[PDB]
Write a protein that binds this DNA or RNA. Structure first.
Ligand SMILES: [Mg+2]
Ligand SMILES: [Mg+2]
Ligand SMILES: [Mg+2]
Ligand SMILES: [Mg+2]
Ligand SMILES: [Mg+2]
Ligand SMILES: [Mg+2]
Ligand SMILES: [Mg+2]
Ligand SMILES: [Mg+2]
Ligand SMILES: [Mg+2]
Lengths: 149, 222, 131, 65, 126, 195
RNA sequence: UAAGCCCAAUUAGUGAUUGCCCAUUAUUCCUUUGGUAAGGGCGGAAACUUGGAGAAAGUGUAGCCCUUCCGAUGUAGAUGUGGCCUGGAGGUUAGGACGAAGCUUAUGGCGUGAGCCUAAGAUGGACCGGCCUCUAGUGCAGAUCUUGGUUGGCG
RNA sequence: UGCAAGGCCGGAAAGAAAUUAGAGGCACCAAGUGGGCCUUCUUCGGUAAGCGGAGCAGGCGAUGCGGAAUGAACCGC
């Protein structure tokens, strides 16, 4: 237990990736965050001022606080028998706007717009077709298999 | 005056019975002809294929029938939580189970413990009739009459016992209802024995998937 | 009485979302069951075709019928594995009635003298011999 | 003698309780002042409105009853 | 005076004695559970003597039923007979071994005059 | 048969540990009613009787007045005055001078709370007397009465944990306000912390 | 010319199943017991002979009565018991020279058990049982326990 | 003015992420424990070990039963 500093065992974790170093994006500076959206707290180095502790690196969570240049993010931390909603304070560059809901952001956007189209809408344009069923399949090349040595 | 309301509503004890064994009768044939028809229709599509130069891919098994074949001894906690969600809480608790993508991977992970396959029609009702129990008010109540079924499911479609079978034999529209409304099938150890229990069914043992050969395994257990 | 029937297992590769009509693969394997035939159907395609049992479907496995029960010769080109001289093939011409019969003797001979058992054993060219 | 054995199974007896939802302890406190000093004054008005909206109710519900 | 019907089968007959009870003239034929950490009885080996479970409980329908039917009820004087005479099918009196001889005759006289079966008597008259 | 279901069993308090012979009458009254009726009230008023004495917190007449004024402001204005049922007991409130003519049903009343009702114009009931008037408990406003702010519930906690405004168990009130409860004694128990 | 080894078998190439033996496992059947688990009665009627859909509004028992489900191991520990026991008190009921406590036991019975009750003493001689509360110097096999007594080795 | 923002809000909204859905949430009081060991998988140190130190899960401890002749741990249960 000789060393347990705030940045311990983190050579490869905060190290920038191969052939992508230097200053942060202009997207990451032109992001727009509110109190409530989700963010991937992907601590990048090359800013080295506002990086969170190692633990909060693959972690995503609500933004409970947006200061001028520091996003405050709550993150669930399974301590021992309970999770703490930790309240980390990082700068914006250590933050992505988390996709994690486009799975149903973009689903119910067109899913309702066609459920409405299917319930009332204007008309019901036919959609994606069935996937798994039978069929009298016609082959196009026969083959066999014994060995290759 | 009390012996009249009863005597009048004891007719409801009789009229609602005969008016229940008729709905039970009229659908149980419609289900049998779904069986007799859609199997005949399966043959021809496999007649026109093998004759005129095609292959009729046998569509898919919609439903699996998962029996836990090793006990509650030392079990990895992920192996153990899966079998708690399949309701395989003790040895030989055959349960009917869809084979979705999410589901069949819960079988992939606990195969050393389970022994599943695809249930024949003859083995789906053999389960339901000889060993079928319902969850009446949190109790394991045997399926003794069709009246026990409709009171428990209530879902406008599930009236008789051959009707629970058709919901189980096909992937059904009421399958999370007919199965979850039942207790896992506490079964007997198969007569004649098991070849092993530690090795897969393909390596001389017996577990994992035995496509359609679990009937020869459930017959000895029902 | 001889175990290990002869199965004709055939199958595509779940067509396809990429190729939409993958070539069909059929081969005949001796196996106790058909679950063991499909288990060794999806071992050839996983190896000789790089196709998973997941990403493919079995078209029609089938039990070959028989040959008119009458004695005849059989040379069975068989390939086993062992720490005993890893991956050696063999010929071991047997004289049994049916192909099922002779290949049975093939397995009960290798497991007898090389201790190589069913899954360490591939088979090829179960044919007959006039003289 | 550090072991960590039996600990993951101790944490899962009484369960690793899930986190509280956001409507628990959503104290926007210690956060950035110019927000909460505005999300304060707007709460004062919205309370004068909540009190006022109940004043007509009862008085409408009296005469119109 | 006759019993009421029952199903009097009994689970276990051999009493539960404590362990090593015969090896010592000091211990008692009275079950004390072995608190021993590695006693063979507590950890229930095969050829060891059993331990009172809930599982040995008599059928409740026939629990407390004397072999003559007639669940028992202790009787001290002839007035306690009348308090039993309504259950003279379900209960039987038992004189209390401290009631002397002068009073014990005054009881056994009344019992036959009441058909209140006593588990005690048969002195030239039952 | 592995279960895991070992600790899902809840402690429901099947019966009462009370020895008061006049509440074992109300309990048998409200097992009959709570069982052989389709009353939601009788269910609820029965678990509150078998409940203990520290859990049947008293409601003051103040609390009863105000909440019965918050009911009676939205009614038919001539329909009826519902009965304020409390399964604890009613205590007078010297902070409420004028009390309405409200009917109340409590297991008990203060001698100053019974006279305050009867002087006001209402009549305080009992539960053998409410089983005669709405036994199903139609038009009855069931009440608990605050059990927070109780001095027992505000010692619950640690009091040395950040964000723990609990009261330490200390007879001497001027004993423990030193180091640990001062910003200038090397640490001050952090009055706030997000949980 | 195996009862060894490696492969297979399972009634013998005749026609598709379980060769066969063993458990505190599984299934089913009874019985207990807990869940406060669900129900239903929770004061008088009949199926050929009796039992109960007449036994009391009830945590707890010799359960209010039925019947239904499910669980049932366990050291440290925790808790419950209308639960067991000893000394004594306040109540009640009651025994006793026609034999109380005690004591003996191949004296049975009955409670899962702690234990209780009985009988019979070619025992004992004068006190004492049940129940509800109260009370404590209240349960012993094991402390190189303490005291008394005996015993082996041992004539 | 209106966008966007916060605290709100009513009009309106439905699903044509599987399973178990063996009920969620807190709270209080109090023990015992704080010498573990074995094992699977992998692996640090050591000539090595029935070795020391770890990670994972399982066990034993605290537990029998069944059988590996025999065995705290193995195989079943
Ligand atoms: Mg075996
Ligand atoms: Mg006995
Ligand atoms: Mg206060
Ligand atoms: Mg004393
Ligand atoms: Mg003492
Ligand atoms: Mg002694
Ligand atoms: Mg001694
Ligand atoms: Mg074991
Ligand atoms: Mg050996």
């Amino acid at each position: 237990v000789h060393s347990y500093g705030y940045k311990s065992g983190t050579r490869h974790l905060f190290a920038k990736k191969f052939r992508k170093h230097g200053a942060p994006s202009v997207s990451t500076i032109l992001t727009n965050i509110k109190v409530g959206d989700y963010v991937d707290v992907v601590a990048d180095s090359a800013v080295r001022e506002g990086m969170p502790h190692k633990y909060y690196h693959g972690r995503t969570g609500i933004v409970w606080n947006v200061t001028p240049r520091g996003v405050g993010v709550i993150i669930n931390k399974p301590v021992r028998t309970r999770t703490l909603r930790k309240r980390i304070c990082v700068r914006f560059e250590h933050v992505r706007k988390s996709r994690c809901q486009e799975a149903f952001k973009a689903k119910e956007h067109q899913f309702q717009a066609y459920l409405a189209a299917k319930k009332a809408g204007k008309a019901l344009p036919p959609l994606k077709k069935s996937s798994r069923m039978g069929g009298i399949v016609r082959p196009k090349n026969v083959e066999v298999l014994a060995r290759r040595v | 005056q009390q012996t009249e309301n009863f005597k009048k509503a004891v007719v409801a004890r009789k009229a609602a019975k005969a008016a229940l064994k008729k709905t039970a009768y009229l659908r149980a044939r419609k289900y049998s002809r779904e069986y007799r028809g859609a199997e005949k229709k399966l043959v021809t599509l496999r007649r026109q294929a093998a004759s005129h130069g095609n292959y009729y891919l046998e569509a898919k098994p919609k439903v699996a029938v998962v029996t836990r074949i090793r006990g509650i001894a030392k079990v990895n906690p992920k192996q153990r939580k899966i079998l708690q969600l399949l309701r395989l809480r003790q040895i030989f608790n055959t349960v009917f189970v869809k084979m979705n993508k999410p589901m069949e991977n819960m079988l992939r992970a606990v195969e050393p413990y389970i022994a599943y396959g695809y249930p024949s029609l003859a083995t789906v009702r053999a389960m339901v009739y000889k060993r079928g129990y319902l969850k009446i008010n949190g109790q394991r109540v045997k399926i003794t009459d069709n009246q026990m079924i409709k009171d428990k499911y209530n879902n406008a479609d599930i009236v008789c016992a051959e009707d629970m079978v058709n919901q189980i034999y096909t992937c059904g529209k009421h399958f999370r209802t007919v199965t979850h409304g039942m207790w896992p099938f506490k079964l007997a150890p198969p007569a004649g024995g098991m070849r092993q229990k530690r090795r897969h069914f393909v390596e001389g043992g017996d577990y994992g998937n035995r496509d359609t050969l679990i009937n020869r395994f459930l017959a000895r257990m029902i | 009485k001889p175990h290990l029937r002869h199965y004709q297992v055939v199958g595509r590769e779940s067509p396809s979302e990429k190729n939409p009509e993958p070539t069909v693969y059929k081969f005949e394997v001796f196996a106790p069951n058909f679950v063991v035939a499909k288990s060794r159907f999806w071992r050839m395609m996983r190896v000789k075709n790089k196709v998973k049992a997941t990403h493919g479907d079995v078209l029609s496995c089938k039990v070959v019928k028989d040959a008119k029960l009458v004695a005849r010769n059989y040379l069975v080109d068989i390939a086993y594995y062992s720490q005993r001289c890893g991956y050696t093939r063999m010929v071991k011409e047997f004289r049994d009635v049916s192909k099922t019969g002779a290949v049975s003797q093939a397995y009960h001979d290798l497991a007898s003298r090389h201790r190589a058992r069913y899954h360490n054993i591939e088979v090829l060219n179960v044919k007959s011999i006039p003289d | 003698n550090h072991t960590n054995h039996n600990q993951s199974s101790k944490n899962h007896r009484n369960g690793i309780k899930g986190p509280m939802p956001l409507h628990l302890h959503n104290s926007k406190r210690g956060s950035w002042l110019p927000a909460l000093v505005n999300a304060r004054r707007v709460r004062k008005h919205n309370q004068k409105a909540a009190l006022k909206k109940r004043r007509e109710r009862i008085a409408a519900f009296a005469a119109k009853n | 005076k006759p019993t009421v019907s029952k199903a009097i089968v009994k689970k276990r007959t051999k009493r539960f004695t404590r362990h090593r009870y015969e090896l010592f003239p000091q211990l008692s034929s009275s079950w004390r559970k072995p608190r021993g950490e590695d006693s063979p009885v507590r950890r229930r080996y095969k050829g060891q003597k059993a331990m009172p479970n809930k599982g040995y409980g008599s059928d409740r329908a026939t629990k407390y039923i004397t072999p003559s039917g007639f669940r028992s009820f202790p009787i001290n004087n002839v007035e306690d007979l009348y308090m039993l005479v309504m259950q003279n099918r379900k209960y039987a009196g038992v004189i209390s071994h401290t009631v002397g001889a002068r009073k014990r005759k005054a009881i056994a006289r009344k019992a036959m005059e009441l058909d209140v079966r006593l588990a005690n008597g048969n002195a030239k008259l039952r | 048969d592995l279960t895991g279901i070992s600790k899902k069993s809840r402690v429901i308090r099947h019966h009462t540990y009370s020895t008061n012979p006049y509440i074992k009458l109300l309990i048998k009254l409200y097992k009959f009613l709570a069982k052989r009726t389709s009353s939601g009230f009788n269910k609820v008023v029965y678990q509150r009787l078998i409940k203990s004495r520290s859990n049947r917190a008293p409601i003051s007449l103040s609390r009863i007045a105000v909440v019965m004024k918050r009911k009676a402001v939205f009614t038919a204005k001539s329909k009826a005055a519902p009965i304020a049922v409390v399964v604890g007991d009613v205590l007078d409130d010297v902070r409420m001078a004028r009390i309405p003519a409200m009917r109340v049903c409590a297991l008990r009343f203060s001698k100053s709370a019974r006279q305050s009702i009867v002087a006001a114009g209402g009549e305080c009931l009992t539960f053998d007397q409410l089983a005669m008037i709405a036994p199903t408990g139609k038009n009855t406003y069931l009440l608990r009465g605050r059990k927070s702010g109780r001095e027992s519930v505000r010692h619950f906690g640690a009091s040395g944990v950040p964000g723990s405004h609990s009261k330490p168990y200390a007879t001497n009130r001027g004993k423990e306000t030193k180091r640990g409860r001062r910003t200038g004694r090397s640490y001050k128990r952090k009055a706030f912390r997000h949980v």
